[PDB]
Design an enzyme around this catalytic site. Sequence first.
Site, short mmCIF file in Angstrom:
data_model
loop_
_atom_site.label_atom_id
_atom_site.label_comp_id
_atom_site.label_asym_id
_atom_site.label_seq_id
_atom_site.Cartn_x
_atom_site.Cartn_y
_atom_site.Cartn_z
N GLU A 23 0.76 -1.53 0.21
CA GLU A 23 -0.11 -0.07 0.35
C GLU A 23 1.08 1.34 0.05
O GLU A 23 0.84 1.99 0.96
CB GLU A 23 -1.48 0.01 1.33
CG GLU A 23 -2.08 -1.49 0.59
CD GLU A 23 -3.05 -1.37 2.23
OE1 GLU A 23 -3.43 0.03 3.22
OE2 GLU A 23 -3.96 -1.77 1.66
N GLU A 78 -4.56 -7.82 -1.04
CA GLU A 78 -5.42 -8.41 0.60
C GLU A 78 -6.62 -7.67 -0.01
O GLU A 78 -7.50 -6.75 -0.83
CB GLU A 78 -4.92 -6.98 1.30
CG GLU A 78 -4.15 -7.01 2.41
CD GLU A 78 -3.72 -5.34 2.74
OE1 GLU A 78 -4.47 -5.06 3.50
OE2 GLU A 78 -2.19 -6.25 3.35
C1 CAC Z 1 -4.02 -5.12 6.80
AS1 CAC Z 1 -3.58 -2.93 5.70
C2 CAC Z 1 -5.01 -2.23 4.77
O1 CAC Z 1 -2.82 -2.36 6.54
O2 CAC Z 1 -2.34 -3.74 4.28
#
Ligand code: CAC
Length: 313
Positions: free
Chosen positions: A135, A247
């Site tokens: 991310e 995810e």
């Molecule tokens: C589980 As996550 C959305 O902090 O990469």
Amino acid sequence: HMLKYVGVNLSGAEFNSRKKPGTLFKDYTYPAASDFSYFAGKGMNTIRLPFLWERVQPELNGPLDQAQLGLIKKSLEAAKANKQYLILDLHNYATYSGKRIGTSDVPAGALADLWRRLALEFKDDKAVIFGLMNEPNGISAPDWANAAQGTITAIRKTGAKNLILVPGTAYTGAHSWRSTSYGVSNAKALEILKDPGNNLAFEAHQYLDKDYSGTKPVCTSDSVGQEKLQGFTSWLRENKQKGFLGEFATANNPVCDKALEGMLTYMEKNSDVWLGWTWWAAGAWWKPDYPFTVQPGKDGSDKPQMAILSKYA
Ligand SMILES: C[As](C)(=O)[O-]
Ligand SMILES: C[As](C)(=O)[O-]
């Protein structure tokens, strides 16, 4: 499973990320060998393994930490023994010790050095998949794409032919992949990537709550998952690329279960471009009230969402 790679995130090594180096078993843990066999028994052939850049490489551009690398290698042995693939997920949000990639403190090249080193360790291994960055955010799509290109290049310069999972910025959300509201989209920025090893897939994440953060145990409709994957799926097709849902998660309730079935079926129907997926999450350190855990109980029992995931594995 109609998809090549299906499984779960085994979360734990990324915990308490402020603590550097942190202490094994106190601040973070690696998964039990029994986690790998449990999921293998459910039909899952892929494990995504979050770990921290700061724990595996305590100084930027410096040597890897051998204890940390040994923990990763131990998890790899378990995955191989259970005929699973292991995604090395550098779970860092495009930051190192709180500072963003692209700042003076953390040049894009530092991420390329990290990956060069991991690629040299794991190049001779067909079970290992390289998950470049969890991310990325706080960086423009073009800037991130430049960082990603540098990293792909660094990996391929080692001779490594392993699959590389490449994310976008904006927390690599499938839903926002094509968004131009704030400037250049992930879709546009990442079109220019080149992989001389020809073994790349694009990693997107997708949650089904109101802001797609996975902050709440709500799915906003019984079809929202499949709907949010469509733009990204079309982009993959348009560009002759493959995708990986690194995810995703749904809570244990009827509307969510319907949404989950719909998104798994959608990826199956679009298996020409979807390579696979990894649910968030399992691992031993989730409390029992965590809405998305599929870690089996102390009593050996399956969690509610596993009955649906197992059908597609
Ligand atoms: C589980 As996550 C959305 O902090 O990469
Ligand atoms: C890391 As989460 C926001 O999927 O619990």
